[PDB]
Every structure is written in structure tokens, then in C-alpha cells.
Amino acid sequence: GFIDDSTLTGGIYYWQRERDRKDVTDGDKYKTNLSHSTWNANLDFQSGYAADMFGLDIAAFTAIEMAENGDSSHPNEIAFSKSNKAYDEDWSGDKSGISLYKAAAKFKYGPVWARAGYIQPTGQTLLAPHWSFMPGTYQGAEAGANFDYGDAGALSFSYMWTNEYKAPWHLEMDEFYQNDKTTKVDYLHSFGAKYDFKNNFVLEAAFGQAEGYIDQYFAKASYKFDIAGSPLTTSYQFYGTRDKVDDRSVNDLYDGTAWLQALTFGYRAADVVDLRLEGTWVKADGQQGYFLQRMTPTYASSNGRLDIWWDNRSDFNANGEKAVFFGAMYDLKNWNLPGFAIGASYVYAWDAKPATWQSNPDAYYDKNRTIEESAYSLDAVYTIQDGRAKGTMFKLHFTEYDNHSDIPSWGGGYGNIFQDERDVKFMVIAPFTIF
Ligand SMILES: CC(=O)N[C@@H]1[C@@H](O)[C@H](O[C@@H]2O[C@H](CO)[C@@H](O[C@@H]3O[C@H](CO)[C@@H](O[C@@H]4O[C@H](CO)[C@@H](O[C@@H]5O[C@H](CO)[C@@H](O)[C@H](O)[C@H]5NC(C)=O)[C@H](O)[C@H]4NC(C)=O)[C@H](O)[C@H]3NC(C)=O)[C@H](O)[C@H]2NC(C)=O)[C@@H](CO)O[C@H]1O
Ligand SMILES: [Mg+2]
Ligand SMILES: [Mg+2]
Numbered sequence: 001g002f003i004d005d006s007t008l009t010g011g012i013y014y015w016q017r018e019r020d021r022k023d024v025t026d027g028d029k030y031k032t033n034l035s036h037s038t039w040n041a042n043l044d045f046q047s048g049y050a051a052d053m054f055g056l057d058i059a060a061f062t063a064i065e066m067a068e069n070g071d072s073s074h075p076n077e078i079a080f081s082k083s084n085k086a087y088d089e090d091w092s093g094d095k096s097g098i099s100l101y102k103a104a105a106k107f108k109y110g111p112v113w114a115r116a117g118y119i120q121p122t123g124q125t126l127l128a129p130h131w132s133f134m135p136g137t138y139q140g141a142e143a144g145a146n147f148d149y150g151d152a153g154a155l156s157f158s159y160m161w162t163n164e165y166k167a168p169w170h171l172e173m174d175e176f177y178q179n180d181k182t183t184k185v186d187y188l189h190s191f192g193a194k195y196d197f198k199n200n201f202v203l204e205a206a207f208g209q210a211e212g213y214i215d216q217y218f219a220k221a222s223y224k225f226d227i228a229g230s231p232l233t234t235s236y237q238f239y240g241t242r243d244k245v246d247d248r249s250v251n252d253l254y255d256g257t258a259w260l261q262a263l264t265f266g267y268r269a270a271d272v273v274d275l276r277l278e279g280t281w282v283k284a285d286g287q288q289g290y291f292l293q294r295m296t297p298t299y300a301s302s303n304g305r306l307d308i309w310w311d312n313r314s315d316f317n318a319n320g321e322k323a324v325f326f327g328a329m330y331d332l333k334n335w336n337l338p339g340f341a342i343g344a345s346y347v348y349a350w351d352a353k354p355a356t357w358q359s360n361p362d363a364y365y366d367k368n369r370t371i372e373e374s375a376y377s378l379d380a381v382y383t384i385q386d387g388r389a390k391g392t393m394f395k396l397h398f399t400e401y402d403n404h405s406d407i408p409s410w411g412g413g414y415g416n417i418f419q420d421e422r423d424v425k426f427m428v429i430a431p432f433t434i435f
Helices: none
Strands: 007-023 029-046 054-068 097-109 112-119 137-148 154-166 188-196 201-210 214-227 230-243 258-269 273-283 322-331 340-352 371-383 393-403 421-433
Touching: 029 421, 097 137, 273 340
Parallel strands: none
Antiparallel strands: 007 029, 007 421, 029 054, 054 097, 097 112, 112 137, 137 154, 154 188, 188 201, 201 214, 214 230, 230 258, 258 273, 273 322, 322 340, 340 371, 371 393, 393 421
16 A cells, blocks of 8 residues: 555764875875765655555655865765766865655556666666665666566566766766766666576676667676585676777777676675675776776766675776685674674785776886785674664774885876775764654
């Protein structure tokens, strides 16, 4: 029933960050890169289905700046950028505001479903929003279907079409453009599918396009099996992208197909420590020099599905780059501290190459150089177990990041690699239900 199955939920969020980065042009001074305290709050209405076919979802969030040092850079991605539209971004500030982030009619008819309006991708395609506390928002529609074949498996597939987007730090939607920020991309769309064989084997794949510009690929195979009574989870993931501009203009991003391949292992040992072993390998020949899982190249302009996230500041996505991640998350419940967990992680990556050509090379550009990067992070988490504030979570994250070069940040033909950093994030997440 439309009314009786309605839910209204939300949260209060607090984020405080101090990040400094090495300026190898000013004597390696670790300068303030981010320093701010910011609140978010959201309210999210989800209706039931009238006649099990017709529903509505509406949700909004606010960001309130609390503190920000004058030397912190922008946008910090928790407040709103001072620039309301992504393609106007000029990196000059941040501001408070209110954004409508869901506003959609939803539909169901047998095995088919659809949503249209201000939406997040929700099916099997490779479109994705950015996530801060809240998600970004697409203007468009998605429709898909679910077919259950009992023990023989289950098939799901969906299609999404969109012509505008806003990241959670943009108050307004913008259209899509090529790398020059002026040649129009009329839409993004994507089709994908998932087959679950109900034996812990699962296959997923999707294709997407940016109109006139980019073809995007995704595939993933996952498998779980028990060792010592606990599942070892494994997956192989492939992400691919090809452009349609190979004239060596500013819009020519990739030579051939660029891709990112990954293998992941996960295992919970002694029922108390979550372990992660992951590796990635990137090919990205051409002018850009790094792999992007999104189909529009401009920062904040759209996003795409990428199931690999190591929270170690760098993306480890340069041409040629190989990288290995080890993480451990230790639940302290047997010290009688249920809800307390501490963790640590480490990344080492090598063979990172630059763009294979540059139009205005800088002093440090050398087509055949290779470099290395590494990082380690520490994590502490507490979730309130009982009472008024049950589920309220406190998190503390520290990262030390090391560029194994003295190439200045964003330079040398490594357009997505920056210099040594120290990063500390403290966040509080306080969900609530009104009904
Ligand atoms: C609530 C919660 O817990 N949320 C997490 C969420 O944090 C996770 O998402 C991750 O969020 C962080 C944000 O904190 C993301 O970090 C982004 O990552 C970007 C790349 O992935 C990185 O992009 C670079 O940003 C630069 C500006 O800051 C760009 O520089 C500009 O380049 C222009 C190019 O010419 C130039 O003209 C400008 O002059 C230059 N800027 C200047 C001069 O100031 C640069 O181009 C850009 N690179 C790319 C490839 O776009 C961001 O800097 C970085 N920002 C931060 C941290 O502030 C991280 O990427 C997110 N995760 C991903 C990618 O997976 C989320 C993940 O699932 O989990 C949630 O739970
Ligand atoms: Mg972006
Ligand atoms: Mg260094």
C-alpha cells in the first residue's frame, strides 16, 4: 500500500579533516591541503506502491560548514562547492546549502521495474553516483527486470539513460561534455546484467556509452567457498574504456582500449579479523595517462561503477601501474569491546607510467619513465550498541601516502598522481527513522 509501506528516514553527519601535501617546488613543505569541519543532514521519503505498481521517492540533504582554514583547497566534497555546476568549477571555495537528491516516480509490473526523475543508478548497469555521505543524482530513467529460475539461478538486467548529473557537492545539475568542456555529450546510457547461479558463483557485465565519445565496459566474476567453516570470497574484475576521438586533439584521451583489471580475496579469520588481499593492473596508453571508470573525463561530471576502493588516497590507476593492497580489520568483541574495531592497511604499487604523449610537456615529462607509490592507513571504528543512539557510528582514519618520485603534484605526464600526503578524517554518522 502506497501509504502504509511508506518510510521516512535520515541522518546527521559530522566530518572533520586535516590533510597536508608536499610541495616539492617550495622545499617540500607539507602545506595545508584540506582543513574543515562540516555537518550534513538528510531526510529521505520512500513511499509504498499503490496497487503494487506506483510509488514516489523524495529526499534532500543539507551541508553546513563549521570550520575551514584559509589555506584549505576546494571543493572539499562534503560541503557544496561554491560553483553550483561541475563545468563551472573554479576551485575557489565551499559553501552551505540544501540539495534535492532524489525525486522520482517508481513503477512495478510483474518482473519489470522502473524509476524516473532525479535518481541514483540502482540496477545492473555501470553508471554510478559519487558518494560523499550522500550520493550524486542523475536526471533520467532506469528500467530493468528480474527473472528467478529457482535452483537454476536468477537473471537481472537493467538499462539507464541520463542527460544531466550533479555530484553531492554540486547544488545544480550540469550536462555532459568531452574533455574540452564545450563539445556536448548528449546523454550517457548503460545496459548491464547479473546472473546468480545460486552456488555462490555470480557473473556480472555491463556496457555503457557517452554519446559520440566513449564506450565503457565492465565484467566481474565472483565465487565464495568455505575454508575452515568461513567463506573465502574471490573475484576477478575487468573495467574497460575506449574513446571515439583519436585525432590528437584535446578530446583524445586513450589510444586503443584502456582498462583496469583486478583480483580480490577476502577472508574472516578466527571469526574476528576481516582480511583483504587485492591487486590491480592498469593499461592506459594515450594522452590522459590513467584509467577512468566514468564515461566523462571532467572531475565531478559523472561517475561509473568501480568495486575496488582501498581508502589510501591515491587511485593507483596510472598507465601500466600494478598495485597490491593488504587490509586487516580487527573486531575487539573478545576484549569485551563489542562495536569497537581497529584496522590497518598498506598499498605498494609499481610500474606507473605517464601519458604516452603530451601537447605541452613539462620539465619532468619522460615518456619511458616508470615510478612507484605506496601508502598505509590506520582505522578505528566504534558503533553504539544499545540505547537512544543505537547504530550511531564514530570513525577515525589516518593515511600516510608516499609518491616515490619528486615530480610535483599533477605534473610530469602523471595527471592523476599527487605528492606525499598525510590525511586524517574523523566522522560521526547518526541515522534515525521517523517512520
Ligand atoms: C561519507 C563517506 O564515507 N564517503 C566515502 C567516500 O569518501 C568515498 O569516495 C571517495 O571520496 C574521495 C573524496 O574524499 C575521493 O577523492 C577524490 O578523488 C578524485 C579522484 O578519484 C580526486 O580527483 C582530483 O581532484 C583534483 C582537485 O581536487 C583535480 O585537480 C584539478 O585538475 C584539473 C585538471 O586540469 C585542473 O585544471 C585543476 O587546476 C586541478 N585543481 C586545482 C588546481 O585545485 C583532479 O583532476 C582530480 N582527478 C580526477 C581523476 O578527477 C580528488 O582530488 C579527491 N578529492 C578529495 C578527497 O577531496 C575518492 O575518489 C572517492 N572514491 C572513489 C573514487 O572510489 C566512497 C567510495 O566508494 O566511499 C564513501 O563511503
Ligand atoms: Mg569525478
Ligand atoms: Mg615522497
